[PDB]
Write an enzyme that holds these catalytic residues in place. Structure first.
Site, PDB file in Angstrom:
ATOM      1  N   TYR A 126       0.850  -1.154  -0.015  1.00  0.00           N
ATOM      2  CA  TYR A 126       0.001   0.108  -0.074  1.00  0.00           C
ATOM      3  C   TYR A 126       0.885   1.187   0.037  1.00  0.00           C
ATOM      4  O   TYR A 126       2.168   1.121  -0.137  1.00  0.00           O
ATOM      5  CB  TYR A 126      -1.045  -0.131   1.165  1.00  0.00           C
ATOM      6  CG  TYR A 126      -2.180   0.852   1.207  1.00  0.00           C
ATOM      7  CD1 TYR A 126      -2.758   1.316  -0.058  1.00  0.00           C
ATOM      8  CD2 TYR A 126      -2.334   1.922   2.239  1.00  0.00           C
ATOM      9  CE1 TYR A 126      -3.733   2.334   0.086  1.00  0.00           C
ATOM     10  CE2 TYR A 126      -3.221   2.570   2.512  1.00  0.00           C
ATOM     11  CZ  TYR A 126      -4.066   2.914   1.149  1.00  0.00           C
ATOM     12  OH  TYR A 126      -4.984   3.871   1.082  1.00  0.00           O
TER      13      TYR A 126
ATOM     14  N   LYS B 267     -14.706 -21.853 -17.516  1.00  0.00           N
ATOM     15  CA  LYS B 267     -13.947 -21.590 -18.639  1.00  0.00           C
ATOM     16  C   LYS B 267     -12.537 -20.842 -18.168  1.00  0.00           C
ATOM     17  O   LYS B 267     -11.471 -21.125 -18.433  1.00  0.00           O
ATOM     18  CB  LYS B 267     -14.124 -20.632 -19.614  1.00  0.00           C
ATOM     19  CG  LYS B 267     -13.655 -20.570 -21.087  1.00  0.00           C
ATOM     20  CD  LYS B 267     -13.485 -22.267 -21.433  1.00  0.00           C
ATOM     21  CE  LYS B 267     -13.783 -22.314 -22.959  1.00  0.00           C
ATOM     22  NZ  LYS B 267     -12.814 -21.153 -23.636  1.00  0.00           N
TER      23      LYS B 267
ATOM     24  N   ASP C 194     -18.729 -16.759 -25.986  1.00  0.00           N
ATOM     25  CA  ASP C 194     -20.258 -16.862 -25.899  1.00  0.00           C
ATOM     26  C   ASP C 194     -20.850 -15.548 -26.120  1.00  0.00           C
ATOM     27  O   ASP C 194     -21.899 -15.399 -25.579  1.00  0.00           O
ATOM     28  CB  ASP C 194     -20.428 -17.424 -24.240  1.00  0.00           C
ATOM     29  CG  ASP C 194     -19.943 -18.704 -24.232  1.00  0.00           C
ATOM     30  OD1 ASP C 194     -20.780 -19.829 -24.819  1.00  0.00           O
ATOM     31  OD2 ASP C 194     -19.415 -18.978 -23.319  1.00  0.00           O
TER      32      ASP C 194
ATOM     33  N   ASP D 273     -14.601 -19.581 -29.628  1.00  0.00           N
ATOM     34  CA  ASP D 273     -15.493 -20.551 -30.157  1.00  0.00           C
ATOM     35  C   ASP D 273     -15.138 -20.850 -31.651  1.00  0.00           C
ATOM     36  O   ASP D 273     -14.623 -21.917 -31.922  1.00  0.00           O
ATOM     37  CB  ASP D 273     -16.686 -19.979 -30.142  1.00  0.00           C
ATOM     38  CG  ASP D 273     -17.286 -20.220 -28.695  1.00  0.00           C
ATOM     39  OD1 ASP D 273     -17.373 -20.955 -27.887  1.00  0.00           O
ATOM     40  OD2 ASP D 273     -17.994 -19.090 -28.184  1.00  0.00           O
TER      41      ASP D 273
ATOM     42  N   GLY E 296     -20.199 -20.621 -42.047  1.00  0.00           N
ATOM     43  CA  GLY E 296     -20.941 -19.648 -41.256  1.00  0.00           C
ATOM     44  C   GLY E 296     -20.352 -19.932 -39.674  1.00  0.00           C
ATOM     45  O   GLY E 296     -20.751 -20.454 -39.234  1.00  0.00           O
ATOM     46  N   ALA E 297     -20.400 -18.462 -39.276  1.00  0.00           N
ATOM     47  CA  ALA E 297     -20.024 -18.529 -37.694  1.00  0.00           C
ATOM     48  C   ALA E 297     -19.031 -19.148 -37.603  1.00  0.00           C
ATOM     49  O   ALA E 297     -17.741 -18.775 -37.916  1.00  0.00           O
ATOM     50  CB  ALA E 297     -21.467 -18.790 -37.107  1.00  0.00           C
TER      51      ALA E 297
ATOM     52  N   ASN F 232     -11.857 -27.820 -27.165  1.00  0.00           N
ATOM     53  CA  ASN F 232     -11.262 -26.583 -27.378  1.00  0.00           C
ATOM     54  C   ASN F 232     -10.097 -26.551 -26.437  1.00  0.00           C
ATOM     55  O   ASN F 232      -9.203 -25.574 -26.430  1.00  0.00           O
ATOM     56  CB  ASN F 232     -12.311 -25.545 -26.969  1.00  0.00           C
ATOM     57  CG  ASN F 232     -13.243 -25.181 -28.043  1.00  0.00           C
ATOM     58  OD1 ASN F 232     -13.029 -25.752 -29.079  1.00  0.00           O
ATOM     59  ND2 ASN F 232     -14.161 -24.264 -28.006  1.00  0.00           N
TER      60      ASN F 232
HETATM   61  N1  LIG Z   1     -14.753 -27.956 -28.989  1.00  0.00           N
HETATM   62  C1  LIG Z   1     -15.541 -27.908 -27.852  1.00  0.00           C
HETATM   63  O1  LIG Z   1     -15.062 -28.078 -26.777  1.00  0.00           O
HETATM   64  C2  LIG Z   1     -16.897 -27.097 -27.978  1.00  0.00           C
HETATM   65  C3  LIG Z   1     -17.039 -26.310 -28.887  1.00  0.00           C
HETATM   66  C4  LIG Z   1     -18.374 -25.775 -29.031  1.00  0.00           C
HETATM   67  C5  LIG Z   1     -19.228 -26.306 -28.359  1.00  0.00           C
HETATM   68  N2  LIG Z   1     -19.090 -27.201 -27.230  1.00  0.00           N
HETATM   69  C6  LIG Z   1     -20.158 -27.682 -26.713  1.00  0.00           C
HETATM   70  O2  LIG Z   1     -21.288 -27.485 -27.266  1.00  0.00           O
HETATM   71  C7  LIG Z   1     -22.058 -26.903 -26.409  1.00  0.00           C
HETATM   72  C8  LIG Z   1     -22.466 -25.397 -26.699  1.00  0.00           C
HETATM   73  O3  LIG Z   1     -23.307 -25.279 -28.084  1.00  0.00           O
HETATM   74  P1  LIG Z   1     -23.313 -23.894 -29.014  1.00  0.00           P
HETATM   75  O4  LIG Z   1     -24.576 -23.708 -29.658  1.00  0.00           O
HETATM   76  O5  LIG Z   1     -22.558 -22.936 -28.199  1.00  0.00           O
HETATM   77  O6  LIG Z   1     -21.982 -24.511 -30.073  1.00  0.00           O
HETATM   78  P2  LIG Z   1     -22.353 -25.298 -31.611  1.00  0.00           P
HETATM   79  O7  LIG Z   1     -23.657 -26.203 -31.317  1.00  0.00           O
HETATM   80  O8  LIG Z   1     -21.231 -26.155 -32.055  1.00  0.00           O
HETATM   81  O9  LIG Z   1     -22.856 -24.079 -32.600  1.00  0.00           O
HETATM   82  C9  LIG Z   1     -23.722 -24.146 -33.596  1.00  0.00           C
HETATM   83  C10 LIG Z   1     -24.322 -22.878 -33.760  1.00  0.00           C
HETATM   84  O10 LIG Z   1     -24.615 -22.934 -35.157  1.00  0.00           O
HETATM   85  C11 LIG Z   1     -25.893 -22.242 -35.154  1.00  0.00           C
HETATM   86  N3  LIG Z   1     -27.148 -23.070 -35.465  1.00  0.00           N
HETATM   87  C12 LIG Z   1     -27.675 -23.229 -36.528  1.00  0.00           C
HETATM   88  N4  LIG Z   1     -28.810 -23.998 -36.684  1.00  0.00           N
HETATM   89  C13 LIG Z   1     -28.728 -24.526 -35.268  1.00  0.00           C
HETATM   90  C14 LIG Z   1     -29.401 -25.702 -34.865  1.00  0.00           C
HETATM   91  N5  LIG Z   1     -30.522 -26.447 -35.364  1.00  0.00           N
HETATM   92  N6  LIG Z   1     -29.322 -25.729 -33.543  1.00  0.00           N
HETATM   93  C15 LIG Z   1     -28.176 -25.310 -32.630  1.00  0.00           C
HETATM   94  N7  LIG Z   1     -27.343 -24.336 -33.236  1.00  0.00           N
HETATM   95  C16 LIG Z   1     -27.581 -23.965 -34.719  1.00  0.00           C
HETATM   96  C17 LIG Z   1     -26.050 -21.534 -33.632  1.00  0.00           C
HETATM   97  O11 LIG Z   1     -25.828 -20.205 -33.571  1.00  0.00           O
HETATM   98  P3  LIG Z   1     -26.941 -18.984 -33.996  1.00  0.00           P
HETATM   99  O12 LIG Z   1     -28.012 -19.187 -32.573  1.00  0.00           O
HETATM  100  O13 LIG Z   1     -26.145 -17.779 -33.909  1.00  0.00           O
HETATM  101  O14 LIG Z   1     -27.562 -19.674 -35.282  1.00  0.00           O
HETATM  102  C18 LIG Z   1     -24.958 -22.368 -32.820  1.00  0.00           C
HETATM  103  O15 LIG Z   1     -24.362 -21.556 -31.755  1.00  0.00           O
HETATM  104  C19 LIG Z   1     -21.716 -27.129 -24.864  1.00  0.00           C
HETATM  105  O16 LIG Z   1     -22.098 -28.430 -24.303  1.00  0.00           O
HETATM  106  C20 LIG Z   1     -20.184 -27.089 -25.276  1.00  0.00           C
HETATM  107  O17 LIG Z   1     -19.441 -27.750 -24.156  1.00  0.00           O
HETATM  108  C21 LIG Z   1     -17.901 -27.679 -27.213  1.00  0.00           C
END
Ligand SMILES: NC(=O)c1ccc[n+]([C@@H]2O[C@H](COP(=O)([O-])OP(=O)(O)OC[C@H]3O[C@@H](n4cnc5c(N)ncnc54)[C@H](OP(=O)(O)O)[C@@H]3O)[C@@H](O)[C@H]2O)c1
Ligand SMILES: CC(=O)SCCNC(=O)CCNC(=O)[C@H](O)C(C)(C)COP(=O)(O)OP(=O)(O)OC[C@H]1O[C@@H](n2cnc3c(N)ncnc32)[C@H](O)[C@@H]1OP(=O)(O)O
Ligand SMILES: CC(=O)SCCNC(=O)CCNC(=O)[C@H](O)C(C)(C)COP(=O)(O)OP(=O)(O)OC[C@H]1O[C@@H](n2cnc3c(N)ncnc32)[C@H](O)[C@@H]1OP(=O)(O)O
Ligand SMILES: CC(=O)SCCNC(=O)CCNC(=O)[C@H](O)C(C)(C)COP(=O)(O)OP(=O)(O)OC[C@H]1O[C@@H](n2cnc3c(N)ncnc32)[C@H](O)[C@@H]1OP(=O)(O)O
Ligand SMILES: CC(=O)SCCNC(=O)CCNC(=O)[C@H](O)C(C)(C)COP(=O)(O)OP(=O)(O)OC[C@H]1O[C@@H](n2cnc3c(N)ncnc32)[C@H](O)[C@@H]1OP(=O)(O)O
Ligand SMILES: NC(=O)c1ccc[n+]([C@@H]2O[C@H](COP(=O)([O-])OP(=O)(O)OC[C@H]3O[C@@H](n4cnc5c(N)ncnc54)[C@H](OP(=O)(O)O)[C@@H]3O)[C@@H](O)[C@H]2O)c1
Lengths: 753, 752
Positions: free
Chosen positions: B37, B92, B135, B160, B194-195, B317
């Site tokens: 301090y 995270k 996120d 992501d 995309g995304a 990840n």
């Molecule tokens: N490598 C890793 O360790 C890793 C990476 C990613 C996720 N995860 C796991 O996945 C889960 C998270 O899910 P997330 O949605 O963030 O990742 P995700 O499912 O891999 O991302 C897919 C993205 O595409 C879009 N989308 C388009 N059609 C969709 C549909 N029918 N259903 C869902 N999404 C659709 C959504 O974005 P919009 O809403 O903008 O369309 C969604 O955020 C957690 O359990 C996490 O641990 C793990």
């Protein structure tokens, strides 16, 4: 840069960069726990908060986390330095936060110099933070920023400048007024300076019972008079008094309280003649106080002096106010910080000052509690919570107080407050005795570690050191080390003291039939160790601290030969291991090679007495490698020692034998051996032989994150202590602190007889 | 809901938060207050006034990232709000700290609007040394990422998209390079651009693919010209030449199939219609898109690497953001560049391609397991190379050896020792045809032993042979409600077919040591004696006991039956796993008061174990004196050190010392520079039983380090005795190391 400046620079340089770090609250290394943290098992708290947003306070650390936000424009005395260089001050503020309240701190040095950016950037961090502390923002931006933030935010916001020191100032003013028996209806205050602290003090004094017309505001240009055309700031013109006291000298006529908050030199003895009856003087602009207390007492003995420095009593510290305010607000889950909480804190501080194991005496030199007083929290954190029970804007509304008290005590364990309490007790003992530090003789005057620790000890006013050795050589070593604090120290050559031959005669008379005659007695007194022991024995010094540069055996032999032990006392080492919530006492680690049952019982009794001195109930455990086996060897000796100690001290709680884990873990003992009379864990551990205690305490000191202090030589008539040759500077500092405590206790016991 | 209640404890448990902030520097005294301090804290401030960058040398800015978010898209859930997402961000952060040693903050910006979020994150620039914003909603994520990269210098990284791109590229490069096809000319089709899939496609085209050389078919159909359904300004970056719309006609299954979104859309007829070698990446939703078993059954000649933790070829990840962000931080890099992304993906691919052994790089080891220690130690240096090459790191670069040393120190024994032991156990099992070591537990009716056995058999480490009544232990298992134990082997010692042979062999062993046929028959009823005989005669590989009885009565049958090998002395061996090193305390259980020769032999055994664990051993004979050589223990320790030095003249064994001198290099160098021990001692040999036992128990209880043991060294076979006061996790660790030792001893016995 001096030695202290270099040490401060290396404080943030050595090891990991910075001082703070983020770790998991509980261990997480197993794959199952990792999945609980990484796999979607952590989404369940999110879904729980989905059905209840405010419940997030119990679903995360938000309720136990405080922002520390600054823009780096009012950094102490540096003025504007920018947000980039305002990071170490935020780290130190967070360190103090954790030390004095136990709240997690997130330091954010936002680069929003403009007010609009600050307002529109801070507001967006609300849902993820539980409270914000604004500080280090230069005027006049800070006032507007805080005023906007208070209305624009729904969680408590606190400014260490706009409601900071003024709380302690109000507590000190209340105590001074109670001493002088003067009410707030007719009181005169001239708050010199126009900084944030001055306006905060004026506002809280007005809200406390003072009259705005009676108070006046003074600055560098002059007293703000009616229709003043200088200083067009809204805040400056708000505290404008219609008078003609623009002249500084005549602005203090009939001034009840100086409460001066201007740079040093604004007070002179001629100026001090202008005060009213029984004035109160406040220091300002550290490290140079407004006026020295000694000259204030000499010129005006009827006055009351309060300072902002550690050297002089009545220290106005900013650490008394903020940690308890925030702890009370967060634990009561208050949604805002209002003036009611601050008034309650001021009242609590005044009450505590008006009224470990002891406290100060109320008087002119004690108007506010010292910052090292732990009870401060216990006496003001609930009171703020009490205001949360009446003022409002607080959720939760805990209905208990003893549970709150023990929760607060859990966050102030020995590992945080033990050395602070020891130093505070040393200061209390010295001040209650008239203000003289105990005389401690250091036989190793030419020791680098001893001198480097003596610098800190003299600065902290712990002991008066008497270094032994050739004056020329020790002075040369001090000059080489560049320590401009030991130049006035007392250096005593062994074979030059006027009482040297008296000591020689005394040692000859003590051990004439133990192999020492005059020819050997003179040669022994030539040694610094024997001369220091004789000095301690004959009363020329209160204590002694040796053994830093030599092995323990030949450093403790002169003490046992000269000072000796008292009636039915056995010399024994003793170490305190300060854990998170308890401190263990290991004995003995230094002297006895293989004590018998009677010696073990006596060591246990001595350790229990030392523990009881600190206000903790002792629970002795005789360590061994067997759990109540009673087999031949060490287990039988430990069982017999436990029985002997029980017979000697029936009211205590002794049990043996047991292993270390059984002794120090109450759950293990309750689950496995519910018959034993030792309940709640053991804070005193008596070891079977020297190897076990020595190795155990050294290993705990090195590889254990806990801190051990010692070893302390107990069982001797006087206060003689020997340091381990592998000690560090901080180890020497702690050992000298406790040696001073022991010396003061022994001297007081001798006098009261 | 106890899985949530575990975090709720983590949120109460005398600690109201998942994460906490401590002080690395001490703060307990007035001098320490002045140092931390005012006015001492002003001293570094004036130092920073000369050069702002010196904050990285003074404050904790360098090792400080943040998980910034707004709750717009949190885990497997849609919009939730910034307030409700904090636990996942803290998860995270703890993952960051565990796998990269990076202190990380949790900031939520309560702003769905792009402008306010960008303004706040930009103005937080001097606060943080790095940004791992994650996120946030899409496609606003691209806008905020671009704005933050353009605004402030510090590296802004969206975990992501880029992490998914890196892991997908790492899983795809090795697979394509081993299928007689190239990642640049052969028409890969993929699923999505995309995304996150936008970053995936950008990484693909940076790794050889293109827009015209590669025809891209999206998860949402195709983003080529024409149809304007579900279009945005940030989708047409990968327009292709395929003119069909329906999945049957738009997707002909040319080279690969990398799905990142949408529910399960993969039919067996389409997989049959796939051209050759179907490479399937079905991470997509939190729930699996298509189960790997169905896809594998659809095409036997298919190489499928799913993105789920329930099946092999795991995609996560943890192989992405941690190591690459550590590399970016260590060089004080400016912004985030693609070159570091391709360096990271190449490092992961090389690590996947190139203990006792490693899993074969076939259809199962496309990428390493997403927790391996070498992952960071390999990726981070390459990311540092890329950052230095790109010319974005203002901080100068030193030799890579010191960088590797720091990266290794980021994961000390306290974080990875037990995990590496488990991995070596699994590798030994796989190299032995999948067989597990047989571990016989004499206490088949002990609650702690059964509770630990649940986890041990769930983790596939040991095969229980629990002894006792075949019905009483089953009743105990049913009462404790452990289903996995319903198939274990229960042996009654007095009813085993080989009981009489064991009685005869025990009688033959100790006929002249006070045991005859009647006494041998009586003793073989003891579960401890029967388990020791089982281990000695080879019917079981190892045994652990003593969880209920005292150590003497539990270890006497082992010594009487199994015995000690030639030039061996029984000893207790304890591992203390500190942050940077692990110490080995011996001996803590058996020898009441070892002599010089016994201490030397104990030191040799402990050094043998330490050498087996891939660490150079440094031995220290502890005492209460520092090279004093006085009568008693110091002389015995000096003689023991001399004898051990003569026995093994390649280790550094040094005299008699105090514990602090032994374990602290600074004290040793400053006070006793005449010694042969340098760098501290990782092996400690205690002068008697009381010292070692009390020291190790006190360190285990009041210390913050983890102590595993005691392990019985010096016996012919694998046989350990637990401490009576042990816990379930202690039993788990002890059984893990007992199984490892049993596998080692069985391998040694198989040869010769
Ligand atoms: N490598 C890793 O360790 C890793 C990476 C990613 C996720 N995860 C796991 O996945 C889960 C998270 O899910 P997330 O949605 O963030 O990742 P995700 O499912 O891999 O991302 C897919 C993205 O595409 C879009 N989308 C388009 N059609 C969709 C549909 N029918 N259903 C869902 N999404 C659709 C959504 O974005 P919009 O809403 O903008 O369309 C969604 O955020 C957690 O359990 C996490 O641990 C793990
Ligand atoms: C922090 C560290 O470094 S711990 C290091 C580990 N400790 C050590 O190496 C030292 C351990 N202790 C010893 O070696 C010895 O016992 C010593 C140094 C205390 C004394 O040396 P010794 O040769 O045994 O004794 P010495 O001749 O100095 O005796 C001095 C006096 O101590 C007294 N004394 C010593 N031990 C005891 C005891 N346990 N109870 C009572 N009196 C005692 C003797 O009565 C003697 O008094 P006397 O002058 O009237 O006869
Ligand atoms: C504060 C901490 O951290 S430790 C707290 C410990 N708590 C306790 O309760 C400690 C327990 N008590 C003790 O340790 C001690 O016995 C104390 C504190 C009571 C001090 O006892 P002392 O006052 O030193 O006893 P001592 O024997 O010196 O006094 C009796 C008289 O005998 C005299 N005497 C005894 N032996 C001798 C001797 N060998 N040579 C000369 N004089 C002697 C003393 O001079 C004294 O005479 P005096 O009073 O005229 O000066
Ligand atoms: C984790 C904890 O709680 S540690 C607790 C502290 N430890 C303890 O209480 C146990 C300490 N150890 C002991 O008490 C004893 O040494 C024991 C129990 C190990 C065995 O010693 P004893 O009871 O005298 O042994 P016993 O006569 O039954 O013989 C057992 C065998 O061990 C062998 N043995 C015992 N110690 C040794 C040794 N140091 N080196 C070699 N062989 C040994 C003997 O040779 C004997 O073999 P044999 O029958 O072929 O001749
Ligand atoms: C992995 C860790 O964490 S610890 C790492 C370090 N650990 C160690 O070093 C542990 C050492 N353990 C071991 O077993 C040693 O490595 C060994 C293999 C050298 C010990 O050898 P032993 O187990 O004594 O067996 P040995 O070499 O005597 O066996 C040879 C033959 O003697 C026979 N034999 C030996 N002792 C006996 C006996 N008491 N009764 C009957 N037959 C016996 C065996 O049956 C074998 O016959 P075979 O050729 O027909 O199979
Ligand atoms: N309790 C404590 O120990 C404590 C607590 C908080 C802060 N502080 C100290 O306060 C300082 C920062 O806050 P602050 O508000 O005091 O800063 P400050 O406003 O700069 O302090 C001095 C100001 O008072 C005015 N002033 C009045 N008489 C003056 C005189 N004779 N000479 C010069 N100025 C005179 C001036 O303002 P005008 O020019 O507007 O007249 C001057 O700018 C730091 O030194 C900090 O350590 C101490």
């Amino acid at each position: 840069t001096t030695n202290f400046d270099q040490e401060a620079l290396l404080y943030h340089q050595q090891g990991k960069p910075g001082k703070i770090e983020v770790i998991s609250s509980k261990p997480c290394a197993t794959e199952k726990d990792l999945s609980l943290a990484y796999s979607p098992g952590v989404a369940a708290p999110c879904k729980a908060i989905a059905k209840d947003p405010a419940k997030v306070y119990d679903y995360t650390a938000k309720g136990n986390l405080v922002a520390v936000i600054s823009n780096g424009t009012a950094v102490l005395g540096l003025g504007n330095i920018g947000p980039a260089a305002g990071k170490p001050v935020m780290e130190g503020k967070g360190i103090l936060f954790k030390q004095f309240a136990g709240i997690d701190v997130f330091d954010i040095e936002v680069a929003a110099t403009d007010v609009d950016t600050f307002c529109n950037a801070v507001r967006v961090l609300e849902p993820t933070f539980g409270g914000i502390n604004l500080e280090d923002i230069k005027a006049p931006e800070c006032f507007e920023i805080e005023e906007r933030l208070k209305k624009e935010m729904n969680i408590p916001v606190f400014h260490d400048d706009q409601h900071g020191t003024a709380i302690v100032s109000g507590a000190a003013l209340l105590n001074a007024c109670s001493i002088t028996n003067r009410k707030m209806e007719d009181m005169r205050i001239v708050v010199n300076g126009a900084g944030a602290s001055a306006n905060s003090c004026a506002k809280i004094f007005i809200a406390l019972g003072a009259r705005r017309e009676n108070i006046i505001m003074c600055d560098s240009q002059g007293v703000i008079y009616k229709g003043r055309t200088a200083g067009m700031n809204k805040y400056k013109e708000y505290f404008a008094s219609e008078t003609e006291a623009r002249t500084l000298t005549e602005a203090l006529r009939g001034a009840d309280v100086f409460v001066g908050l201007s740079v040093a030199g604004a007070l002179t003895p001629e100026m001090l003649k202008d005060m009213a009856k029984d004035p109160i003087i406040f220091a300002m602009a550290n490290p140079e106080p407004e006026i020295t207390p000694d000259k204030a007492r000499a010129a005006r003995p009827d006055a009351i002096i309060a300072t902002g420095r550690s050297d002089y009593p009545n220290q106005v510290n900013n650490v008394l106010g903020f940690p308890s305010i925030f702890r009370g607000a967060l634990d009561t889950r208050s949604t805002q910080i209002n003036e009611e909480m601050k008034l309650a804190a001021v009242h609590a501080l005044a009450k505590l000052a008006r009224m470990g194991g002891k406290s100060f005496k109320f008087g002119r030199d004690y108007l506010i509690p010292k910052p090292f007083d732990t009870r401060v929290l216990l006496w003001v954190a609930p009171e703020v919570a009490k205001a949360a029970m009446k003022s409002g804007v607080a959720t939760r509304a805990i209905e208990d107080w003893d549970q709150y008290r023990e929760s607060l005590e859990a966050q102030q364990g020995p590992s945080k407050v033990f050395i602070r309490s020891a130093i505070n007790r040393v200061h209390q003992n010295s001040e209650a005795n008239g203000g003289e530090l105990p005389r401690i003789v250091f036989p190793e005057g030419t020791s680098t570690k001893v001198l480097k620790a003596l610098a800190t000890l003299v600065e902290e006013r712990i002991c008066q050191p008497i270094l032994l050795g050739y004056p020329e050589r020790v002075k040369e070593k001090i000059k080489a080390l560049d320590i401009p604090l030991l130049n006035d120290v007392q250096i005593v050559h062994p074979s030059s003291h006027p009482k040297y031959f008296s000591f020689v005669e005394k040692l000859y008379s003590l051990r004439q039939r133990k192999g020492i005659n005059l020819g050997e007695a003179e040669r022994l007194m030539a040694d610094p160790n024997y001369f220091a022991a004789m000095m301690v024995n004959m009363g020329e010094a209160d204590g002694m601290v040796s053994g830093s540069s030599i092995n323990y055996a030949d450093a403790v032999r002169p003490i046992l030969q000269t000072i000796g032990t008292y009636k039915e006392g056995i010399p024994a080492g003793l170490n305190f291991v300060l854990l998170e919530d308890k401190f263990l006492v290991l004995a003995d680690t230094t002297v006895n090679f293989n004590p018998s049952a009677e010696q073990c019982a006596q060591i246990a009794l001595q350790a229990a007495k030392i523990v009881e001195y600190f206000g903790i109930e002792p629970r002795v455990a005789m360590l061994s490698y067997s759990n109540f086996s009673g087999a031949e060897g060490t287990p039988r000796k430990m069982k017999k020692a436990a029985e002997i100690a029980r017979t000697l001290r029936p009211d205590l709680m002794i049990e043996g034998d047991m292993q270390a884990d059984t002794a120090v873990n109450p759950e293990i003992m309750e689950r496995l051996f519910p018959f034993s009379g030792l309940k709640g864990g053991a804070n005193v551990l008596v070891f079977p032989n020297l190897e076990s205690s020595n190795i155990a305490y050294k290993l705990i000191q090195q590889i254990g994150k806990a801190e051990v202090i010692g070893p302390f030589l107990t069982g001797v008539r006087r206060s003689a202590n020997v340091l381990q040759r592998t000690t560090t500077v901080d180890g020497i500092v702690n050992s000298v602190v406790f040696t001073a405590l022991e010396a003061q206790f022994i001297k007081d016991a001798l006098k009261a007889r």
